[PDB]
Structure formats: structure tokens, C-alpha cells
Amino acid sequence: SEDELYRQSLEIISRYLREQATGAKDTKPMGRSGATSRKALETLRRVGDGVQRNHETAFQGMLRKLDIKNEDDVKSLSRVMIHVFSDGVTNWGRIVTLISFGAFVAKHLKTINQESCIEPLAESITDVLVRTKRDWLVKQRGWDGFVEFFH
Numbered sequence: 661s662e663d664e665l666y667r668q669s670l671e672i673i674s675r676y677l678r679e680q681a682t683g684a685k686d687t688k689p690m691g692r693s694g695a696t697s698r699k700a701l702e703t704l705r706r707v708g709d710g711v712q713r714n715h716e717t718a719f720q721g722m723l724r725k726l727d728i729k730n731e732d733d734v735k736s737l738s739r740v741m742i743h744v745f746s747d748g749v750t751n752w753g754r755i756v757t758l759i760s761f762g763a764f765v766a767k768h769l770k771t772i773n774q775e776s777c778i779e780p781l782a783e784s785i786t787d788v789l790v791r792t793k794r795d796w797l798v799k800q801r802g803w804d805g806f807v808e809f810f811h
């Protein structure tokens with residue numbers, strides 16, 4: 661509960677996936693360090709949308725292989741993301757890739773009428789990110805470092 665990095669990471673990732681899936685912006689205010697969270701979500705819309713467009717075939721290929729139909733499938737994706745994401749090197753390129761693939765899957769979840777799985781997917785991505793890359797994120801100045809890196 662006393663973990664600002666986790667709270668802010670979940671807020672950003674949750675909002676991006678939800679707005680990617682529904683096409684609607686969330687109007688609830690951002691709690692603590694609102695400006696940073698706003699700018700981060702703003703950066704994701706530019707860079708994340710970019711990754712999904714530029715790498716559509718690779719994302720569609722991966723989604724087809726994973727065959728997501730339900731909550732059990734979304735649960736097993738987290739195991740995949742740990743192996744895939746956590747075993748490789750650490751940088752904002754791969755972090756945006758992970759979150760962008762998150763958003764790609766979220767749109768699929770809306771397509772197949774499994775919207776209830778989007779919040780659990782966002783929490784699973786947040787947990788992989790902040791659990792496996794804590795020390796890297798803190799050293800990089802967290803979401804302020806993310807905003808500055810993609811300016």
C-alpha cells in the first residue's frame with residue numbers, strides 16, 4: 661500500500677489499456693504526481709500507438725499464437741511476459757513494447773467481449789514491470805525519466 665511507484669505505474673498502464681480498448685478517455689483525476697502521470701499517458705498514446713501500428717503483424721502473430729479466449733488465457737500471458745520481458749535487457753524501448761502489446765491484447769479483449777479481463781491484464785503488466793525492474797526504474801527517475809526520455 662505504501663508504494664508510490666507501483667500505484668502510479670498501475671494508474672498509467674490501467675488507463676492506457678482501458679482507453680486503447682474502448683476509445684474513451686478516463687476523466688477521473690490522477691491522485692499524487694498528476695502532472696507526471698498525465699504526461700506519461702500522453703507519451704504512451706504517441707509511442708505506444710506507434711509501436712502497435714509499426715509492429716502490427718508481429719503483435720497479431722503473437723496474439724494468434726497465444727489464442728486468448730478468457731481469463732485463464734490472460735492469467736497465463738503473465739508467465740509469458742516474465743520469461744519474455746524479465747529475461748531480456750532493461751530499457752524504455754522494451755518497457756513501451758510490453759505496455760503496447762498489453763494495449764494490443766486489451767483491444768482484442770474488447771473485440772471478444774472479455775472487457776472484465778482488461779483490469780487484471782493491466783495489474784499483471786504493472787506487477788511484471790515494477791516487481792522485476794524496480795531498481796532500474798528508480799535509477800531512471802521512474803515516469804519522470806520515461807517522459808523526459810521520449811520528450
Ligand SMILES: CCc1sc2ncnc(N[C@H](Cc3ccccc3)C(=O)O)c2c1-c1cccc2[nH]ccc12
Nearest residue numbers: 715718719722740741744745748754755757758761
Ligand atoms: C509476449 C510478447 C512480448 S511482451 C514484450 N515485451 C518487451 N519486448 C518484447 N519484444 C521486443 C522485440 C519486439 C519489439 C517490437 C515488436 C515485437 C517485438 C524484445 O524482446 O526486445 C515483447 C514481446 C514480444 C517478444 C518477441 C516477439 C514478439 N512478437 C510480438 C510481441 C513480441
